[PDB]
UniProtKB/Swiss-Prot annotation, chains A, D:
Changing D94H: In Barcelona; O(2) affinity up. Changing H116L: In Vexin; increased oxygen affinity. This is Hemoglobin subunit beta. It comes from Homo sapiens. Changing D73G: In Tilburg; O(2) affinity down. Heterotetramer of two alpha chains and two beta chains in adult hemoglobin A (HbA). Heterotetramer of two zeta chains and two beta chains in hemoglobin Portland-2, detected in fetuses and neonates with homozygous alpha-thalassemia. GO terms for biological process: blood vessel diameter maintenance; carbon dioxide transport; cellular oxidant detoxification; hydrogen peroxide catabolic process; inflammatory response; nitric oxide transport; oxygen transport; platelet aggregation. Changing A128D: In J-Guantanamo; unstable.
UniProtKB/Swiss-Prot annotation, chains B, C:
The initiator Met is not cleaved in variant Thionville and is acetylated. Changing T41S: In Miyano; O(2) affinity up. Heterotetramer of two alpha chains and two beta chains in adult hemoglobin A (HbA); two alpha chains and two delta chains in adult hemoglobin A2 (HbA2); two alpha chains and two epsilon chains in early embryonic hemoglobin Gower-2; two alpha chains and two gamma chains in fetal hemoglobin F (HbF). It comes from Homo sapiens. This is Hemoglobin subunit alpha. Changing A120E: In J-Meerut/J-Birmingham. It is linked to Heinz body anemias: Form of non-spherocytic hemolytic anemia of Dacie type 1. After splenectomy, which has little benefit, basophilic inclusions called Heinz bodies are demonstrable in the erythrocytes. Before splenectomy, diffuse or punctate basophilia may be evident. Most of these cases are probably instances of hemoglobinopathy. The hemoglobin demonstrates heat lability. Heinz bodies are observed also with the Ivemark syndrome (asplenia with cardiovascular anomalies) and with glutathione peroxidase deficiency.
Length: 146, 141, 141, 146
């Protein structure tokens, strides 16, 4: 990454306070609600007819936890996101057919969830470092598309 | 919004396309697949090989729709309603991809209508595709 | 298109902002400058340092305009004619930038209105800022 | 910059046929005409009120030639665009204050210009090589922004 030691420490430190279970479920669900078209990949999850139905859908919450899980582990290889997400990049391309733009939508949603959760703690400088990470992650995941 | 000038420009350039619309539609697709590989994620079910009939078939459908929007330049929202519904509810193509196809359509026309692809016409055609894209994406949320 | 639910959601949310809209305007700009430094290209004449009065002042201006937009949620195009003009013919900010400020505004609201920033409200505000953005760049060409 | 050798030969072969003076004037003029907001940087160029006023403006033509001149040099250092464009990146940021999105608009216009000029010779695969190139140059020009 093009993260400053100071930027790295800010990311790292806020992350330590995150409940991936809850943030994962919330980020994915918000995604399905704010940008309804992302629902095209989760038809098998059920009823996503309403915010309520999305936010309550356990399949959603559990997929959300899987995604933030993988994200969370990528924060440990911040100096090689490319290599950490290589296999996941191929899968997303070759098996899932997920347009990389979705990676960017989620990232933005992720940042809104963190702000939502941390209020005061999520300062302009801290958001700036997270913006760099979400962009970094999205790029890494889209890297193997062909 | 398209001005009288724009409308004239578009009917004129599209007029020249005539019977080649179908082929230009297929070509714009191929250019898109080659330059913006991420767009391929929407056609997992297609043979995207060079000269694919699926691509040929699809290029024609897209070209027919554009030809229909030109024919109804003063009532596009209504002329394209059906296609707007399909994209919003079934296909669910991310909006950013419309700009990519638009771009490849402009390249294609440029490559085929040297005499008509003037600065003025280029500008009108760009506003036109942007408006088509806007209609097709209007019912997304 | 803003649904009635949307209009309600927006008015509620903005309702809670109240006397802090100016501070939230200022905070959104600050967040924009830091996260998307390319946006600073439009403010060479400002002191973009933390707590600058130029930024505070501008923050108020923006906040105020949003207020006026919420108030005329039914007639935005008309309520914002002048602003659409200014941006299209004088400021000429590239359209991609509106999405950046919109995002920093959501983040700001989220961080300040926890209880109120529900998923449905988040969706509504986003559409709202999108509509505002459309209005502001509608006369660009 | 993922230019395969074959993509690089293709860029270079076509570039051999270009009249930079001419293409430069066309690309810049067309930019000012298709995305009129870009005219914000040239209020000292005079009359840009209509397409003919723009396309024929001696100042636009001279500036276009300058711009494409710098671009051609870039094409001889495809290996090190960032290095090649560093002082220009700084200048555009710090002195000129040019939003980098401008570099991407110009790249799209340039691609249309090459299509316009080369017709059938600007094949799908040649366009794809040039797409990578204009993106690499835009990125290089934006690398020093802060
Ligand atoms: C932060 C970015 C993301 C990360 C780290 C990520 C990671 C993952 C992981 C670890 C899996 C598990 C699959 C396996 O190992 O077999 C998965 C599956 C999947 N992801 Fe992604 N993902 C991301 C973004 C997205 C987005 C934005 C979408 C669509 C909106 C998406 C759609 C899917 C789908 C449809 C599956 C398959 C789940 C199933 O089998 O039902 N992913 N993802
Ligand atoms: C202005 C641009 C566009 C136009 C005029 C257009 C028009 C059409 C038309 C006429 C059809 C066929 C509907 C039918 O089955 O009768 C179609 C289908 C489709 N379009 Fe769009 N479209 C546009 C943009 C896009 C973009 C940008 C994408 C994705 C990159 C896309 C993806 C699809 C897909 C996946 C299908 C279904 C194809 C099939 O399964 O046969 N469209 N479109
Ligand atoms: C949410 C959308 C926006 C709204 C409601 C908005 C509103 C305003 C308002 C109310 C003014 C002041 C008019 C006056 O001075 O009388 C203004 C000026 C200005 N805006 Fe916009 N704006 C928006 C988006 C943007 C964006 C995204 C940018 C650039 C990144 C921008 C750049 C400017 C600049 C440079 C000025 C003039 C500043 C000065 O010299 O005082 N605006 N805008
Ligand atoms: C391929 C991308 C570009 C290249 C290689 C390029 C190159 C150059 C060069 C070599 C100069 C002269 C440097 C000097 O005065 O010392 C220049 C100046 C300038 N460029 Fe760029 N440029 C590019 C894109 C753009 C775009 C897209 C815009 C605006 C939309 C722009 C705005 C300007 C302006 C306003 C000047 C100064 C003009 C003056 O002398 O008053 N450039 N550029």
């Amino acid at each position: 990454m093009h993260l400053t030691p100071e930027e790295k420490s800010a990311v790292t430190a806020l992350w330590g306070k995150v409940n991936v279970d809850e943030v994962g479920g919330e980020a994915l669900g918000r995604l399905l609600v704010v940008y309804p078209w992302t629902q095209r990949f989760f038809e098998s999850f059920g009823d996503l007819s309403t915010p309520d139905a999305v936010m309550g859908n356990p399949k959603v919450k559990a997929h959300g936890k899987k995604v933030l899980g993988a994200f969370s582990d990528g924060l440990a290889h911040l100096d090689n996101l490319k290599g950490t997400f290589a296999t996941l990049s191929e899968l997303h391309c070759d098996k899932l057919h997920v347009d990389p733009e979705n990676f960017r939508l989620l990232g933005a949603v992720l940042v809104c969830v963190l702000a939502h959760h941390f209020g005061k703690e999520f300062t302009p400088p801290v958001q700036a470092a997270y913006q760099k990470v979400v962009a970094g992650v999205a790029n890494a995941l889209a890297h193997k598309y062909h | 919004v398209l001005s009288p000038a724009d409308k004239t420009n578009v009917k004129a350039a599209w007029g020249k396309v005539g019977a080649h619309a179908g082929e230009y539609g297929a070509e714009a697709l191929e250019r898109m697949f080659l330059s913006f590989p991420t767009t391929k994620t929407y056609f997992p079910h297609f043979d995207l090989s060079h000269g694919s009939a699926q691509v040929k078939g699809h290029g024609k459908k897209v070209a027919d729709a554009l030809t229909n929007a030109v024919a109804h330049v003063d009532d596009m929202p209504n002329a394209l309603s059906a296609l707007s519904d399909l994209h919003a509810h079934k296909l669910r193509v991310d909006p950013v991809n419309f700009k990519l196809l638009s771009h490849c359509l402009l390249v294609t026309l440029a490559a085929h209508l040297p005499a008509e692809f003037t600065p003025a016409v280029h500008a009108s055609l760009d506003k036109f595709l942007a408006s088509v894209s806007t209609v097709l994406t209007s019912k997304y949320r």
